[PDB]
């Protein structure tokens, strides 16, 4: 997509933006680079703020791209890993009351294997039959030669449906860019 502005920081539906526009929201361990992915697709450095390595994103952030879509940035599973569950109620409601939600891009790190939270997430995300675009990120930190031994583990771990799709990615080198935008567009222009 020949592709960039914030709109709001909703903590509940009584805040979600207006317009009834389409949205793709992200789910990911904390620090995984969800805030980064978002930026990588619409070509921004820190529109969605990134951080050294903490738990910087802390609210559902809506980013209207070309006034045609909505990327929604989300805190990592549980921000400060009680607050665990506090996190769910929110992502859940949303992913069960936001009809425009046109799919969830769940991002996991390629290097390691999906943490149960990721299987969990995906599971839930699947119980509601929400289309998902898994993203093996930070490819660039894995010897190009071993991206199969790593990305095979995911598929098995998250045992990803055949309807859903895994994609290798880099917020550094931008690898997986378009693939993302393609799948993301299948979901939008379905
Ligand atoms: N080398 C590398 N670093 C990455 C990559 N993606 C994200 N990072 C680094 O990881 C850190 C956190 O990235 P973010 O995008 O803020 O993380 P996040 O998952 O959105 O974090 P929260 O908003 O707290 O959930 C930063 O220092 C980024 O520069 C990637 O593909 N390669
Ligand atoms: Mg984030």
Swiss-Prot record:
Residues reported in the UniProt entry to bind GTP: 28-35, 55-59, 73-76, 137-140, 169-171
Pfam entry (one): MMR_HSR1
Transmembrane segments: none
GO terms under cellular component: cytosol
Swiss-Prot/TrEMBL cofactor(s): Mg(2+)
Residue sites binding Mg(2+) per the record: 35, 57
Top-rank taxon, per record: Bacteria
Gene Ontology biological process: division septum assembly
Gene Ontology MF, one: metal ion binding
Alphabetically ordered keywords of this record: Cell cycle, Cell division, GTP-binding, Magnesium, Metal-binding, Nucleotide-binding, Septation
Annotated knockout phenotype: Essential for growth, it cannot be disrupted. In depletion experiments cells become over 3-fold longer, are abnormally curved and nucleoids condense.
Every EngB-type G domain range: 20-190
Family of the protein in this entry: Belongs to the TRAFAC class TrmE-Era-EngA-EngB-Septin-like GTPase superfamily. EngB GTPase family.
Miscellaneous comment as given in the Swiss-Prot or TrEMBL entry: Estimated to be present at 1000 copies per cell.
Record function comment: Necessary for normal cell division and for the maintenance of normal septation.
Annotated protein name in UniProt: Probable GTP-binding protein EngB
Organism: Bacillus subtilis (strain 168)
Lineage of the organism: Bacteria, Bacillati, Bacillota, Bacilli, Bacillales
């Amino acid at each position: 997509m020949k592709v960039s502005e914030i709109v709001i920081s909703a903590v509940k539906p009584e805040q979600y933006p207006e317009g009834g526009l389409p949205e793709i929201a992200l789910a990911g361990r904390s620090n995984v680079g969800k805030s980064s992915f978002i930026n990588s697709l619409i070509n921004r450095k820190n529109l969605a703020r990134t951080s050294s390595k903490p738990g910087k994103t802390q609210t559902l952030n809506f980013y209207i791209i070309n006034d045609e879509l909505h990327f929604v940035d989300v805190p990592g599973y549980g921000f400060a890993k009680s607050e665990r569950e506090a996190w769910g109620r929110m992502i859940e409601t949303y992913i069960t009351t936001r009809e425009e939600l046109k799919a969830v891009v769940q991002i996991v790190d390629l290097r390691h294997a999906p943490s149960n939270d990721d299987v969990q997430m995906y599971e839930f995300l699947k119980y509601y039959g929400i289309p998902v675009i898994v993203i093996a990120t930070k490819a660039d930190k894995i010897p190009k030669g071993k991206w199969d031994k790593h990305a095979k583990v995911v598929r098995q771990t998250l045992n990803i449906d055949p309807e859903d799709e895994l994609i290798l990615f880099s917020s550094e080198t931008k690898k997986g860019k378009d693939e993302a935008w393609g799948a993301i567009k299948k979901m939008i222009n379905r």
